Amino acid sequence: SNATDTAEQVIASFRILASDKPYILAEELRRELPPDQAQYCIKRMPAYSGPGSVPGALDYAAFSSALYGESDL
Amino acid sequence: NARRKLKGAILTTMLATRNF
């Protein structure tokens, strides 16, 4: 769907900012995003608990699909 | 409105600030 296509492009952007890790860290968000937007992401991204998880790992994929994608499923 | 404005700004940051 069009919403999924947009969300995937956002996911791809976060993935680059995360250096191709499957999650992103708060320090990477603060490094790359405007402070208000970094804080929003730090507060609202769900924790990443998949393979390779670490304390503080943030699930940018789930966050992006909820915000821009086909979220009502 | 608040969420709509915030997510539009984030979309600009994520898609329209780097040459990705």
Side-chain angles (χ1 to χ4, degrees), chain A residues 1-26 28-38 40-73, chain B:
Chain A
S1 85
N2 288 341
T4 295
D5 294 344
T6 297
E8 284 297 332
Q9 196 186 341
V10 175
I11 293 167
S13 177
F14 279 119
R15 180 174 295 124
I16 291 162
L17 298 183
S19 305
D20 297 327
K21 295 194 292 303
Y23 55 87
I24 196 162
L25 296 170
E28 294 165 329
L29 295 160
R30 297 194 189 100
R31 172 164 87 197
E32 302 289 354
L33 270 58
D36 69 315
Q37 294 172 20
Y40 182 84
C41 291
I42 290 164
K43 173 186 193 160
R44 299 291 284 277
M45 286 187 170
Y48 174 82
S49 302
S53 185
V54 299
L58 299 169
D59 192 344
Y60 58 79
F63 171 84
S64 300
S65 295
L67 201 49
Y68 303 108
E70 209 62 80
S71 61
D72 193 16
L73 290 164
Chain B
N1 285 342
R3 177 174 163 107
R4 273 188 292 278
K5 175 173 171 282
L6 192 34
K7 83 187 176 173
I10 291 171
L11 194 62
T12 287
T13 296
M14 299 313 298
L15 304 188
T17 65
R18 280 81 161 158
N19 296 316
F20 288 162

